[PDB]
DNA sequence: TAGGGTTAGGGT
DNA sequence: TAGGGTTAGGG
């Protein structure tokens, strides 16, 4: 089976009273959990307002994310696919967006190439192939109706599209880069 | 005199018609410029929408920033203290915020200490000393929110600041998403 | 392989 | 030395 990283969900905005027990009972609705933790301050043991749960398979995570919104202990939480600790310190590592940067597609890639490839990850709202104000600059953007497709796509850094070793990144604004 | 970085302003949101002549003509109201450039696309020569002006002293930039807002060729621009090229790639390097992160102040630093130190950089809107909600002990860092972003930008040009007898570190305040 | 009327660098 | 009732990791 896939690594823990691909079976783990970051659950943000937990109620400070949420415990490993109550967090476990809820997400077990979609399968067996191999791990569950509420992150706390080491000194005071106070809840930090987030935690992690690990499902037994990717399919169990996809099922959980398909059943949003999630409410735990009377508070609406925001589950997200886990970003690896090694990405800490990089700009935009933990930003949640609906738009995807796609680079390395060169000049022979058009909107329909991206649509055929990415449509399987979720509902596509818009696709943009960047040009010069009219040559193609080699990269474009894909905007989904939800952030989870973007989060799932970026778990694989490189994606073969239209015969190119393409690179995917969560879309960042100018200020954030 | 200070180095160029401390005498240079990033001018964002320029009108695409603005040229180096009109940009100089505008900012020369506050002193002599040692450098001035409008950034352009090398291939198509189209304006990239920003440029840089470098004054002869830090008093001139401060005078220029004291006269905001700035409008050039019919467009309101956003001048900012220049962030060094070496900072590219760091989270929040180019973000514009009114709030300042202050670390290394330990448990013996209170609001008035931050107030006394930072009041000279600009008007302070709020000050927060972070504590543990359960233990109540101070966690060794706080935030200072100004009414403008420029005081923050000027402060962070000096990474280390002696506050209340501590080697304090200042950073532009970032949201959870940006970190 | 960082867009966009969204604003991070070229240099006698 | 990363908050905030604003959400990036312990075992």
UniProtKB/Swiss-Prot annotation, chain A:
Principal cellular location given in the protein's record: nucleus
Keywords, sorted A to Z: Acetylation, Cytoplasm, Disease variant, Host-virus interaction, Isopeptide bond, Methylation, mRNA processing, mRNA splicing, mRNA transport, Nucleus, Phosphoprotein, Repeat, Ribonucleoprotein, RNA-binding, Secreted, Spliceosome, Transport, Ubl conjugation
Modified residues (Omega-N-methylarginine): 24
Modified residues (Phosphothreonine): 126, 143, 160
Record-listed Phosphoserine modification sites: 15, 71, 173
Post-translational modification: Sumoylated in exosomes, promoting miRNAs-binding.
Localization per record: Nucleus; Nucleus, Nucleoplasm; Cytoplasm; Cytoplasmic granule
Domain RRM: 7-90, 98-175
Cross-link (Glycyl lysine isopeptide (Lys-Gly) (interchain with G-Cter in SUMO2)): 8, 90, 98, 106, 123, 136, 152, 157, 170
Modified residues (N6,N6-dimethyllysine): 90
Modified residues (N6-acetyllysine): 152, 157
Any one of the GO CC terms: chromosome, telomeric region
Domain of life: Eukaryota
GO terms for biological process, alphabetical: DNA geometric change; miRNA transport; mRNA export from nucleus; mRNA processing; mRNA splicing, via spliceosome; mRNA transport; positive regulation of telomere maintenance via telomere lengthening; primary miRNA processing
One example GO MF annotation: DNA polymerase binding
Disease linked to the protein: Inclusion body myopathy with early-onset Paget disease with or without frontotemporal dementia 2: An autosomal dominant disease characterized by disabling muscle weakness clinically resembling to limb girdle muscular dystrophy, osteolytic bone lesions consistent with Paget disease, and premature frontotemporal dementia. Clinical features show incomplete penetrance.
Functional summary from the UniProt entry: Heterogeneous nuclear ribonucleoprotein (hnRNP) that associates with nascent pre-mRNAs, packaging them into hnRNP particles. The hnRNP particle arrangement on nascent hnRNA is non-random and sequence-dependent and serves to condense and stabilize the transcripts and minimize tangling and knotting. Packaging plays a role in various processes such as transcription, pre-mRNA processing, RNA nuclear export, subcellular location, mRNA translation and stability of mature mRNAs. Forms hnRNP particles with at least 20 other different hnRNP and heterogeneous nuclear RNA in the nucleus.
Record note on domains: The disordered region, when incubated at high concentration, is able to polymerize into labile, amyloid-like fibers and form cross-beta polymerization structures, probably driving the formation of hydrogels. In contrast to irreversible, pathogenic amyloids, the fibers polymerized from low complexity (LC) regions disassemble upon dilution. A number of evidence suggests that formation of cross-beta structures by LC regions mediate the formation of RNA granules, liquid-like droplets, and hydrogels.
Protein's UniProt name: Heterogeneous nuclear ribonucleoproteins A2/B1
Covered range of the whole protein: 15 to 193 of 353
Swiss-Prot record, chain B:
Compartment(s) where it occurs, according to its Swiss-Prot or TrEMBL record: Nucleus; Nucleus, Nucleoplasm; Cytoplasm; Cytoplasmic granule
Lineage summary: Eukaryota, Metazoa, Chordata, Craniata, Vertebrata
Disorder: Inclusion body myopathy with early-onset Paget disease with or without frontotemporal dementia 2: An autosomal dominant disease characterized by disabling muscle weakness clinically resembling to limb girdle muscular dystrophy, osteolytic bone lesions consistent with Paget disease, and premature frontotemporal dementia. Clinical features show incomplete penetrance. Oculopharyngeal muscular dystrophy 2: An autosomal dominant, early-onset myopathy characterized by progressive muscle weakness, ptosis, ophthalmoplegia, dysphagia, and variable degrees of respiratory insufficiency.
Included stretch of the parent chain: 15 to 193 of 353
Keywords: Acetylation, Cytoplasm, Disease variant, Host-virus interaction, Isopeptide bond, Methylation, mRNA processing, mRNA splicing, mRNA transport, Nucleus, Phosphoprotein, Repeat, Ribonucleoprotein, RNA-binding, Secreted, Spliceosome, Transport, Ubl conjugation
Residue numbers bearing the N6,N6-dimethyllysine modification: 90
Occurrences of domain RRM (ranges): 7-90, 98-177
Swiss-Prot/TrEMBL domain comment: The disordered region, when incubated at high concentration, is able to polymerize into labile, amyloid-like fibers and form cross-beta polymerization structures, probably driving the formation of hydrogels. In contrast to irreversible, pathogenic amyloids, the fibers polymerized from low complexity (LC) regions disassemble upon dilution. A number of evidence suggests that formation of cross-beta structures by LC regions mediate the formation of RNA granules, liquid-like droplets, and hydrogels.
Highest taxon in the source lineage: Eukaryota
Protein name (Swiss-Prot/TrEMBL): Heterogeneous nuclear ribonucleoproteins A2/B1
